[PDB]
Design a protein around this ligand. Structure first.
Ligand SMILES: Nc1ncnc2c1ncn2[C@@H]1O[C@H](COP(=O)(O)OP(=O)(O)OP(=O)(O)OP(=O)(O)OC[C@H]2O[C@@H](n3cnc4c(N)ncnc43)[C@H](O)[C@@H]2O)[C@@H](O)[C@H]1O
Ligand SMILES: Nc1nc2c(ncn2[C@@H]2O[C@H](COP(=O)(O)CP(=O)(O)OP(=O)(O)O)[C@@H](O)[C@H]2O)c(=O)[nH]1
Ligand SMILES: [Mg+2]
Ligand SMILES: [Mg+2]
Ligand SMILES: [Mg+2]
Ligand SMILES: [Zn+2]
Lengths: 79, 40, 1091, 158, 71, 93, 210, 105
DNA sequence: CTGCATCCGAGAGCTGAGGGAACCCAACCAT
DNA sequence: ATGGTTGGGTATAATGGGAGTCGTCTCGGATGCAG
């Protein structure tokens, strides 16, 4: 299928971003009828909830990196 | 912006939207022009 | 200084009074000085004569009205926050048809605001201007069918809110149909109601073919007119019981009731001229002898059929034609609101007549005047067309009074209007300025009246033309509308003349806006002046013909924002309109009659006229305008001086010897300078600051109130706890700062204590403000003329003055659209200087010229150089003024002075000048083989001089354009804009920082700022912005505590706005629940909302 | 580097180019008085003639700058890319050219004056139509582009 | 008050209204009565021409402690 | 530009990982009062005021300098966080 | 009417006015609704605004910040630094001293200069059309009321000097400062993200001179 | 405090709405015209929505902390933080059922 | 019985700044 | 024990309302037309 940007954006899985975009009453009533769960995949939902966006320094690829010197690492190695 | 392979974690969707939208403001005149881009 | 003027065009008539569009309109609406027996049927008199008699029996009939004198003068109204108004009394009589008794009484109806001499109003102590509105004229129009070509739609349009628009259209099946109130139905039914037979219609519309066949319907005709009336009523009001008298009343009110339907005088005139018939009144039909009589419908249908049949002499209408658009001025809008109030008063009267005891009733007891006062107050306080008057300088007020708006109540919408209404129509020529308009989203919707234009009694703009007879231009001047203008061939005003005979074989002319070339015999009218094409603001730009229209727009708009200066000068190059502008703004003072001056003071001028009467004119001194600028009048006359009629007595703000003085004439060089004039920036010399150039005076008002509270009254006093005597030095014994004290941010202006046993609630100077306290005003309960709000015991106001010098970040502009912010202030020894030691004052970057194509500033600079060395000023009218050869001759004389001075003292040509002359010889600016003086003169005749660098002493490698330029300081001051906040007040609901510098607010981090933060991948910065700095209450408290304790800020939490969103979604009966990874509820409200 | 009025050099060829045009126009009128041309054909021929005259004037202006004043301020500004494009320079020096009515159709007479020579009142009013149309174009375009950008952000944000 | 204004040809003062009510009425009591008769205004009253500014946008919260106060 | 920014960008596979490492090292330096630094006493970042040169208070500059020296180890799942912090506290109270 | 006013029939209005009452649906939706006005965008603390002036003597990574603006923006840091020094006995005394303009001395400016050492601020010009509309700069304290901007970032900001104003924001924590210094530094953003061509490049007078 | 990972939206039953509410709003009164205090059973009642002042009941018997969760016998106001006035809901019991317009229009 | 075809109604149109109308009478809870 | 507040009562006859708005564009249900 091929649909314009408006209809593609309003048809997403996340009801928070679609509700904050446009046609709020329709999106909200459909999501409430369906009991939709928003999994917070995109950026708009995390911004709305005031969370750390899954991009840049908030990406799971890099945000669990640790840093340590050589002296502290050796002490833990002896332990 | 760095002339090197993109880093993992880059929000390329936002970058794409801004890249398309910036010139359209004022640069693209107004079937032809901005209406053509919007129609497409 | 001698003034020399160019130009060949002689103007037969002077400019009309520039504020007449307001003054004449309101005078005609009020008719205050016309005795009641000779008052016309316009204005509020028409409203009175229409609403009355209030028939019920009892009859209340209007006889006449009068207007009293204002209870308080203008300055008292300004000081006490009152409205400058006059009482309105109407004398009425109650008669009893059955009995006969007549009770006559004069009833007080309320107050009507009065326009001042300058053309503004004083509403609640504030100066206001009513903006004229442009809209579609009422009448009959015919337009092409958009859906299907070859068909036409007829429209009947009454005055706004005075009836429904009526559409007539030939349906594709052949039957004609009339649409009213969104109800399609066949017009033949209503035609039968009006009393038309088959033979009459057939003979009136037989010629035009099959349209009359498609009109025919035997079912409708067979019914008697009354039956047709009932049937039409049941089509128009489905469900409503079809009583005869009910249907009669409804249909009468639809098209035939003068109190409900009203084609205006303009609409009547336009219908009569379009249809070639005679109206009896202002309605589409008349109700006479229990029978409807037609007035407009059949002529409209005839014209429509003839147009559809292609009969010659029938054309469609251009709805943007200025003959089809009209202007509602202040008087008409006020009269419309007055009519609405009068209708509500009539309703109240009728109700009281029904319920009241008819035996003991008088006009006073029947009439409740509250609705009329409410309507007038609403119009003058909440109408979008009633605007806070712009009085930065007198030109600002003059411009504001001549403004025309397409927006407003009943007007167009800025988001839905597109291209059609915003375009410059051909008929705008001489009526609406094509240049002056806002640049943003309001472009083309707000415009200005042309300089010579006049709004006629019907609301149509007229422009003047000279009559030409047999190739001879006469002195007869005819003011014409666009429709009348369309019937002639009009020659341009710059047509060559010998005496008053057209001395040109080929004449450029306009025919219905189309340029044409005609012989002198074919000429019927000629333009009066180029000045008539543009507005007053655009008429003040010299060399306007050398400027692109966009930059002329910028210059015209930017002359309104010029700030009055304490050493303001008139421009070196003027257009010849500055004196009329100064005179017509009523800012300066002029001698009423021939006489002699007796007493002169900084606040008073007493003049002894030849009548022997002494007249004393007080002077307005250091008065705060609506925009904070100080407007004062300074005497320009001496004791014993002889003054003729109209001679200047005192200069107003931004005036120099009666000439408009919005800025300063400065020496400028056009050259780059170390990147400090990069991209519109401006470099200025410290010598400007040394001699108080571009120094302005500004006044700010700080207001406080002591009111009544449940815990005890507030009190303004000096006794304030918990402050040392260093903070209470300047307060007097009454708790108010003393006059003349200097105040800085944090200092107390008025002391106040509130019952907390009391606590400090004093008024202090906000950050970034302060100055010298110049005035204090105290208003207490009971004082004459004071009307405080209930509960407030007293109010104290303090006026504080500032003397602002030019600084980095201030905005300067010339009249050609060149604007820029001061970026660097250099000492005198660093500025480029002439070989005689004179430094320049301003350096402008040449890169601003080529793409803006405003060449008028360059010619202004050349003429300014010539005038600077010749010591004279110039008047150069637009499109007829100084040309290049004249400027070159003046520059030759100026060079003779500028160089003979040096040669007399015993100096030759400098070595640096020789090097520059060599460079210019290579550049091709001078001809090889001439002496150094001849090449220097050639450069001077090109407007260029050898310039030396103040930092090194070496000359600029090429000759540089140098000359005098008129530059104004703009109201955009960095002092009033710089603002910063760490923490402060928060909003009630969202718990987010407030907005605005006045509220000590924070900057808004909007959607695209968030988008940029996301595109950078700066997740932690964005999370900080969205929680720790806006609405995470615990988060922001902890962050501040950690920062002041030296630690790092903690992790953020859920923002309060999301909790507000959850609660508002619950109020809509929607269950929003936050879940963890195992789909179990997570309580974000910390157990404070769970039972 | 500075800008004077004489720095907007008017080429001599322009005068010739104008007379040549004033020649052919007469011819066109003849061809319309003898039935050989329709209204549409004559209108298009006049428009084409004036367009080619404008192009010739542009070429003459820049040839004069290249041959005689290679260090001219406007020429240097345009060639270095600092400020200005050839059309604006032609408007400053050669002639403004043809203008569009509010209906979108061209006028029959062009503006034969440059900004250095100074326009007449009628020519200024005629150009005001295009100036106003460009301003209104900008005003609507900015809003339409903002709305489009918001839609794109909403569709690609994830 | 409306009858007094009709008679006087101008807005009456509070003392005149107090005199016209009868015994047991002074200007202060009239002031209190006018004070308690004031009807609240809407937090959603539009300020300015554009549909972007409401009255409640200009009202600060005075209940919750500020970050400085909490510290 | 920041000194050695090209080297820092070349030391990691993703620039956001470099940002995360720098921020975490700055937090570590701030928490222990710059006593856990890997810089020699003559590589310490200095700041010039009227009284004289003192230590640079900006921990992010210290973190970038330390990353430049190459004496810091960074990666995924190097040491448990609790044990890491306890050991750091043991060496530097 | 309570749930969605102005949807079926004539909207409910308050007497004496034509203004429709604002229902919950009106609160939720629109440009002024909760989502677009308070959730996807907020007003923030530690921010300011001022007119911009050309900064030709600045380096690529530097911006000129007014002294008063900087004092207001970094106020808690300045209070802590004043506590560390002998300027004030306690934070409350430092705040009271900083409250009145005429009560400020000389050493507080040196303390402020020590406070901002190495830190960066965010400059932003509306409208923000691309990410380059926000950039990080090291502040140099200047006199006056105007922000000084480097000439080479004007094209990225679409900024000129005919009255333009810009907003200033302060990243607070170590993570925010690291992100601003590494990712959003002006000297680190030299090529266009849209085309890959240089975006900070000579223009106007620089091209003319060369 | 568990991390939030998903947000769900669904229809609310009358039982759910009644479990949300801390009491039924029975009167249209907002505040008293003399004392500017909330009216009992009104739209601002402290018995339903919570106290205006922190740790202080309506009648002033208790004005101190440690009484969290304790309801004053005379006035019926719980002793807790006043911030609960922006979280605690009420409800109106309709005499007849009404349709939610979102699902109609 | 299907299909397409106008027809109606519903939801949109950049950011930032600044902008403010009856009267009377008697019992009864609250303070 | 006082004022403030609240419930009840008035008897010729009365019997269906009233303001308003016509200068915007695009897209998805739906009733109407034909085959
Ligand atoms: N009801 C009514 N009746 C009559 N007239 C009415 C009216 N409503 C509106 N108007 C008209 O609206 C205009 C009011 O002026 P405004 O445009 O409101 O403001 P200004 O005083 O000109 O200041 P500004 O700072 O915008 O100036 P400039 O463009 O030089 O500033 C340059 C810089 O400012 C910034 N800027 C300007 N406009 C911007 C915008 N829209 N968005 C963002 N930034 C903007 C940019 O950084 C830019 O580079 C008048 O022409 C007036 O006639
Ligand atoms: N978001 C908006 N910004 C605007 C609007 N109007 C003006 N502006 C801003 O103000 C700027 C005004 O630009 P100017 O007209 O001065 C022209 P610019 O500097 O772009 O070009 P040159 O004249 O070629 O030097 C514009 O670029 C925007 O940054 C508007 O309606 N919306
Ligand atoms: Mg503007
Ligand atoms: Mg610019
Ligand atoms: Mg600008
Ligand atoms: Zn209690």
């Amino acid at each position: 299928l091929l649909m314009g940007v408006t209809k593609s954006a309003l048809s997403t899985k996340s009801w928070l971003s679609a509700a904050s975009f446009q046609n709020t009453t329709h999106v909200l009533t459909e999501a409430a009828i369906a009991g939709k769960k928003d999994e917070l995949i995109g950026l708009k939902e995390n911004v709305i909830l005031g969370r750390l966006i899954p991009a840049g320094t908030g990406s799971d690829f890099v945000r669990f990196t640790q840093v340590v010197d050589q002296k502290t690492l050796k002490a833990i190695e002896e332990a | 912006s760095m002339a090197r392979p993109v880093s993992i974690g880059e929000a390329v969707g936002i970058v794409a939207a801004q890249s398309i939208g910036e010139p359209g403001t004022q640069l693209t005149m107004r079937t032809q022009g901005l209406p053509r881009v919007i129609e497409l | 200084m001698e003034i020399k003027r160019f130009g060949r065009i002689r103007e037969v008539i002077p400019l009309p009074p520039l504020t007449e569009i307001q003054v004449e309109s309101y005078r005609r609406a009020l008719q205050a000085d016309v005795p009641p027996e000779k008052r016309e049927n316009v204005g509020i008199q028409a409203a009175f004569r229409e609403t009355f008699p209030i028939e019920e029996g009892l009859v209340l009939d209007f006889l006449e009205y009068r207007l009293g004198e204002p209870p308080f003068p203008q300055d008292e109204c300004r000081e006490k926050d009152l409205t400058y108004q006059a009482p309105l009394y109407a004398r009425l009589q109650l008669i009893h048809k059955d009995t006969g008794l007549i009770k006559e009484d004069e009833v007080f109806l309320g107050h009507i605001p009065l326009m001042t001499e300058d053309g503004s109003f004083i509403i609640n102590g504030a100066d206001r201007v009513i903006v004229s509105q442009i809209h579609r004229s009422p009448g009959v129009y015919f337009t092409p069918d958009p859906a299907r070509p070859g068909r036409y739609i007829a429209s009947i349009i009454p005055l706004p809110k005075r009836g429904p628009w009526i559409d007539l259209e030939v349906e594709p099946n052949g039957v004609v149909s009339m649409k009213v109130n969104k109800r399609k139905f066949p017009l033949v039914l209503l035609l039968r109601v009006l009393g038309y037979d088959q033979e009459t219609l057939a003979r009136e519309l037989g010629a035009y073919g099959e349209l009359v066949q498609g009109l025919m319907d035997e079912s409708v005709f067979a019914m008697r007119p009354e039956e047709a009336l009932i049937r039409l009523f049941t089509l128009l009001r489905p469900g409503d019981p079809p009583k005869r008298d009910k249907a009669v009343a409804y249909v009468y009110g639809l098209i035939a009731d003068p109190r409900r339907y009203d084609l205006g005088e303009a609409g009547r005139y336009k219908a009569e001229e379009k249809l070639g018939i005679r109206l009896s009144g202002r309605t589409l039909a008349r109700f006479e002898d229990g029978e409807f009589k037609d007035e407009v419908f059949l002529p409209t249908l005839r014209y429509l059929f003839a147009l559809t049949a292609g009969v010659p002499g029938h054309e469609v209408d251009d709805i943007d034609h200025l003959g089809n658009r009209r202007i509602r001025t202040v008087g008409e809008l006020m009269t419309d609101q007055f009519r609405v109030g009068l209708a509500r008063l009539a309703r109240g009267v009728r109700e009281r007549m029904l319920m009241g005891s008819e035996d003991s009733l008088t006009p006073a007891k029947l009439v409740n005047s509250r609705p009329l006062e409410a309507a007038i107050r609403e119009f003058f306080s909440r109408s979008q067309l009633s605007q806070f008057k712009d009085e930065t300088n007198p030109l600002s007020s003059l411009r504001h009074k001549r403004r025309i708006s397409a927006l407003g109540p009943g007007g167009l919408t800025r988001e839905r209007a597109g291209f059609d209404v915003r375009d410059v129509h051909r008929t705008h020529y001489g009526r609406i300025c094509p240049v002056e308009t806002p640049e943003g989203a309001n472009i083309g919707l707000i415009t200005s009246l042309a300089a010579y234009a006049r709004v006629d009694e019907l609301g149509f703009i007229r422009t003047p033309y000279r009559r030409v007879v047999g190739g001879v231009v006469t002195d007869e001047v005819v003011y014409m509308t666009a429709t009348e203008e369309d019937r002639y061939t009009i020659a341009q005003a710059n047509t060559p003349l010998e005496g008053n005979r057209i001395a040109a074989e080929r004449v450029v002319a306009r025919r219905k806006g189309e340029p044409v070339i005609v012989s002198p015999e074919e000429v019927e009218f000629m333009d009066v002046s180029p000045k008539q094409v543009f507005s007053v603001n655009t008429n003040l730009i010299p060399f306007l013909e050398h400027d692109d229209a966009n930059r002329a727009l910028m210059g015209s708009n930017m002359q309104t924002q010029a700030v009055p200066l304490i050493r303001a000068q008139a421009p070196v190059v003027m257009t010849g309109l500055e004196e009329r502008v100064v005179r017509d703004s009523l800012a300066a003072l002029y001698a009423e009659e021939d006489g002699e001056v007796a007493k002169v003071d900084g606040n008073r001028i007493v003049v002894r006229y030849e009548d022997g009467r002494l007249v004393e004119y007080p002077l307005r001194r250091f008065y705060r305008s609506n925009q904070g600028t100080a407007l004062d009048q300074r005497p320009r006359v001496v004791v014993g001086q002889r003054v003729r009629k109209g001679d200047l007595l005192a200069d107003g703000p931004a005036s120099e010897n009666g000439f408009l003085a919005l800025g300063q004439n400065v020496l400028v060089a056009i050259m780059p300078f170390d990147g400090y004039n990069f991209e519109d920036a401006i470099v200025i010399s410290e010598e400007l600051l040394k001699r108080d150039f571009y120094t302005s005076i500004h006044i700010e008002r700080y207001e406080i109130e002591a009111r009544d509270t449940k815990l005890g009254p507030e009190r303004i006093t000096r006794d304030i706890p918990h402050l040392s005597e260093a903070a209470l030095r300047d307060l007097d014994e009454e708790g108010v700062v003393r006059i003349g004290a200097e105040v800085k941010p944090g200092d107390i202006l008025v002391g106040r204590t509130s019952f907390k046993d009391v606590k400090d609630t004093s008024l202090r100077v906000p950050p970034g403000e302060g100055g010298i306290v110049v005035r204090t005003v105290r208003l207490r309960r009971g004082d004459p003329g004071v009307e405080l709000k209930p509960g407030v015991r007293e109010v104290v106001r303090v006026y504080v003055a500032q003397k602002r010098k030019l600084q980095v970040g201030d905005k300067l502009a010339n009249r050609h659209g060149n604007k820029g912010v001061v970026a660097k202030i250099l000492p005198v020894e660093d500025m480029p200087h002439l070989p005689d030691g004179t430094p320049v004052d301003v350096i402008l970057n040449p890169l601003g010229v080529p793409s803006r194509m405003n060449l008028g500033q360059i010619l202004e600079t050349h003429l300014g150089l010539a005038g600077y060395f010749l010591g004279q000023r110039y008047i150069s009218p637009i499109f007829d003024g100084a040309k290049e050869p004249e400027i070159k001759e003046l520059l030759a004389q100026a060079f003779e002075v500028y160089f003979g001075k040096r040669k007399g003292e015993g100096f030759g040509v400098d070595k640096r000048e020789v090097e520059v002359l060599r460079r210019a010889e290579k550049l091709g600016l001078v001809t090889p083989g001439k002496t150094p003086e001849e090449q220097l003169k050639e450069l001077f005749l090109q407007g260029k001089v050898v310039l030396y660098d103040g930092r090194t002493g070496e000359p600029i490698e090429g000759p540089i354009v140098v000359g005098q330029m008129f530059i104004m300081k703009l109201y955009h001051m960095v002092e009033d804009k710089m603002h910063a906040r760490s923490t402060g007040p928060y909003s009630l609901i969202t718990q987010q920082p407030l907005g605005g510098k006045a509220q000590f607010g924070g900057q808004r981090f909007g959607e695209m700022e968030v988008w940029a933060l996301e595109a950078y991948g700066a997740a932690h910065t964005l999370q900080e912005m969205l929680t720790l700095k806006s609405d995470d209450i615990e988060g922001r408290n902890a962050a501040y505590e950690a920062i002041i304790k030296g630690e790092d800020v903690p992790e953020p939490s859920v923002p309060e706005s999301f909790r507000v969103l959850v609660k508002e979604l619950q109020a809509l009966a929607l269950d929003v629940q936050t879940l963890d990874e195992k789909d179990n509820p997570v309580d974000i409200f910390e157990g404070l909302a769970s039972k | 580097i500075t800008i004077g009025i004489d720095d907007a050099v008017i080429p001599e060829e322009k005068k010739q180019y104008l007379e040549e045009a004033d020649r052919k126009l007469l011819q066109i009128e003849q061809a319309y008085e003898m039935g050989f041309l329709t209204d549409r054909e004559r209108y298009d021929q006049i428009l084409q003639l004036w367009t080619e005259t404008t192009e010739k004037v542009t070429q003459a202006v820049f040839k004069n700058f290249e041959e005689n004043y290679p260090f001219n301020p406007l020429y240097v500004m345009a060639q270095s890319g600092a400020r200005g494009n050839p059309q604006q320079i032609r408007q400053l020096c050669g002639l403004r050219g043809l203008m569009q009515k509010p209906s979108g159709e061209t006028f029959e007479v062009p503006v034969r004056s440059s900004f250095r020579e100074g326009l007449t009142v009628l020519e200024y009013f005629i150009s005001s139509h295009g100036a106003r149309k460009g301003g209104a174009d900008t005003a609507l375009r900015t809003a339409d582009s903002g709305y489009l950008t918001r839609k794109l952000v909403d569709v690609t944000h994830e | 008050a409306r009858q007094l204004q009709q008679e006087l040809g101008r807005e009456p003062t509070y003392e005149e209204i107090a005199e016209a009510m009868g015994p047991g009425w002074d200007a202060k009591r009239v002031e209190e009565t006018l004070k308690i008769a004031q009807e609240p205004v809407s937090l959603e009253t539009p300020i300015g021409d554009e549909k972007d500014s409401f009255y409640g946008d200009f009202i600060p919260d005075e209940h919750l402690p500020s970050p400085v106060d909490a510290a | 530009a920041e000194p050695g920014i090209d080297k820092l960008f070349g030391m990691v596979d993703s620039k956001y990982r470099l940002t995360v490492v720098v921020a975490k090292r700055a937090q570590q330096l701030l928490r222990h009062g710059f006593k856990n630094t890997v810089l020699e006493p003559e590589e310490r970042p200095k700041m010039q005021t009227l009284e004289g040169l003192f230590d640079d208070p900006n921990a992010v500059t210290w973190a970038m300098k330390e990353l430049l020296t190459g004496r810091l180890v960074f990666g995924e799942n190097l040491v448990p966080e609790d044990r890491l912090q306890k050991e750091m506290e043991r060496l530097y109270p | 009417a309570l749930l969605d006013n102005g949807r079926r029939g004539a909207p409910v209005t308050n007497p004496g006015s034509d203004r429709p009452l604002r229902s919950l649906t009106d609160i939720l939706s629109g440009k002024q609704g909760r989502f677009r006005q308070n959730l996807l965008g907020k007003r923030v603390d530690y921010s300011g605004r001022s007119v911009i002036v050309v900064g030709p003597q600045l380096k690529l990574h530097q911006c000129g910040l007014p002294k008063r603006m900087a004092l207001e923006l970094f106020k808690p840091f300045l209070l802590k630094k004043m506590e560390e020094k002998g300027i004030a006995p306690n934070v409350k005394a430092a705040r009271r001293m900083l409250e009145r303009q005429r009560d400020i001395k000389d050493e507080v400016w040196d303390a402020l200069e020590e406070v901002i050492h190495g830190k960066v601020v965010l400059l932003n010009r509306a409208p923000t059309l691309h990410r380059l509309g926000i950039q990080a700069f090291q502040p140099v304290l200047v006199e006056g009321q105007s922000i000084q901007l480097h000439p080479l970032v004007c094209e990225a900001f679409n900024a000129d000097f005919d009255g333009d104003q810009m907003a200033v924001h302060v990243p607070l924590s170590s993570f925010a400062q690291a992100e601003a210094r590494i990712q959003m530094l002006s000297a680190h953003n030299l090529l266009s993200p849209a085309s890959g061509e240089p975006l900070a490049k000579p223009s106007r007078d620089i091209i003319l001179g060369l | 405090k568990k991390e939030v990972r998903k947000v769900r939206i669904a229809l609310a039953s009358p039982e759910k709405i009644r479990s949300w509410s801390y009491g039924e709003v029975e009167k249209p009164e907002t505040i008293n015209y003399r004392t500017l205090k909330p009216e009992r059973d009104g739209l601002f009642d402290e018995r339903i929505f919570g106290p205006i002042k922190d740790y202080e009941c309506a009648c002033g018997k208790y004005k101190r902390q440690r009484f969290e969760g304790k309801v004053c016998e005379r006035c019926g106001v719980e002793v807790t933080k006043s911030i609960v006035r922006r979280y605690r809901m009420g409800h109106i019991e309709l005499a007849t059922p009404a349709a939610h317009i979102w699902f109609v229009k």
